């Protein structure tokens, strides 16, 4: 179906403890393929998916150089931001950056991103037109002017609409067996008596990919959103994902309840009921 | 593939 590539950058200052921590990770959809850790011995971009290991030394040397440049830029940014907001030098702060592109089923460009956050809050973000910027406060305003004069948006757009999309396609092809797979969820239901008058019905979805999925409970066809416990979709660690929705059922009403599962790998939505 | 253009400063 639809696909996307994303790079996540986190930079955390450590006052009096030297250079800031820098961590970069790349994703194709819900699969990480690369990473760089400033505190690692290698000082290189490393593969994190088997299908990227085929990339020669030129790819790794190149990516290593660019991620190092990314790193140095963020180290400076931490100082500039500490100035914008008149903050001391003893406090630890966080800068986060994310950029990437979305493509439809036809693998054609659909949407591009490039966003910054400071201490967990939106700082500056490229708008959907990839031509304008969003700045909430004065600090961000300054940055916006700077980036407007250096025509940053125009260059970022070239990457997001061109390079980003092109290489996203390349990764999809090179890693077809895993990146282009759709694993329908394995579903089952558990039943446990919490007391004499009640029991827990839990609907399971396992070993599915991608991560996007919908799990709901119904009682006689009526949604139970606020009476069902929904856990966050979670990684199994093997590249697949998990999720469950539980509902407390009064003993004797099992038949009234239905679990509904929607996922890319399912032709039609599944309906399950304890019986 | 990382953005290859020199990222401008904040």
């Amino acid at each position: 179906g639809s696909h996307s590539m994303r790079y996540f950058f986190t930079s955390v200052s450590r006052p009096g403890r030297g250079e800031p921590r820098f961590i970069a990770v790349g994703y194709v959809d819900d699969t990480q393929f690369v990473r760089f850790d400033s505190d690692a011995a290698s000082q290189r971009m490393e593969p994190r998916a088997p299908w990227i290991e085929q990339e020669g030394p030129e790819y790794w040397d190149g990516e290593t150089r660019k991620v190092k440049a990314h790193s140095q830029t963020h180290r400076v940014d931490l100082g500039t931001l500490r100035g914008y907001y008149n903050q001391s030098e003893a406090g630890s702060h966080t800068v986060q950056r994310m950029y990437g592109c979305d493509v439809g089923s036809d693998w054609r460009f659909l949407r591009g991103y490039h966003q910054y956050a400071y201490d967990g809050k939106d700082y500056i973000a490229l708008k959907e037109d990839l031509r304008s910027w969003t700045a909430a406060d004065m600090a961000a305003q300054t940055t916006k002017h700077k980036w407007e004069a250096a025509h940053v948006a125009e260059q970022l757009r070239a990457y997001l609409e061109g390079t980003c999309v092109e290489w996203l396609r390349r990764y999809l092809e090179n890693g077809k067996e895993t990146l282009q797979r759709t694993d329908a969820p394995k579903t089952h239901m558990t039943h446990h008596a919490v007391s004499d008058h009640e029991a827990t019905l839990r609907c399971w979805a396992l070993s599915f990919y991608p991560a996007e999925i919908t799990l709901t409970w119904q009682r006689d066809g009526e949604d139970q959103t606020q009476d069902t416990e929904l856990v966050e979709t979670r990684p199994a660690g093997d590249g697949t994902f998990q999720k469950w929705a539980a509902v407390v059922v009064p003993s004797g009403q099992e038949q009234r309840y239905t679990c509904h599962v929607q996922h890319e790998g399912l032709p039609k939505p599944l309906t399950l009921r304890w019986e | 593939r990382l953005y290859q253009n020199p990222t401008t400063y904040i």
């Binding site: 961590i23 994703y27 839990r202 979670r234 660690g237 093997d238 | -």
Partner: protein
């Protein structure tokens, strides 16, 4: 500065089967800042051979990490995840439940 408390899930990669190799997962998400302590416990003792995924974050800028270790479940063995964070007055212990 903003601070968000980590959500915690302790679970196995595959359905728990006594005597069969598996992976004990502790998934922490929705927290900020990124400084965080996560330990996997076995009968109260923290496990040493514990790996974790590379620091990443969600759309809303909050971080998530996956800590994991190779293990083989048994009837008597107790497992739990210990998490400490600036948003917690005391380390949060979440016991592993086969059915969760």
């Amino acid at each position: 500065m903003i601070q968000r408390t980590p959500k915690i899930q302790v679970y196995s990669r595959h359905p728990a089967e006594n005597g069969k190799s598996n992976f004990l997962n502790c998934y922490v998400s929705g927290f900020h800042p990124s400084d965080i302590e996560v330990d996997l416990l076995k009968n109260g003792e923290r496990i040493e051979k514990v790996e974790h995924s590379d620091l990443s974050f969600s759309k809303d800028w909050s971080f998530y990490l996956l800590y994991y270790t190779e293990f083989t479940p048994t009837e008597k063995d107790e497992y739990a995840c210990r998490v400490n964070h600036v948003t917690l007055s005391q380390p949060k212990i979440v016991k592993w439940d086969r059915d969760m």
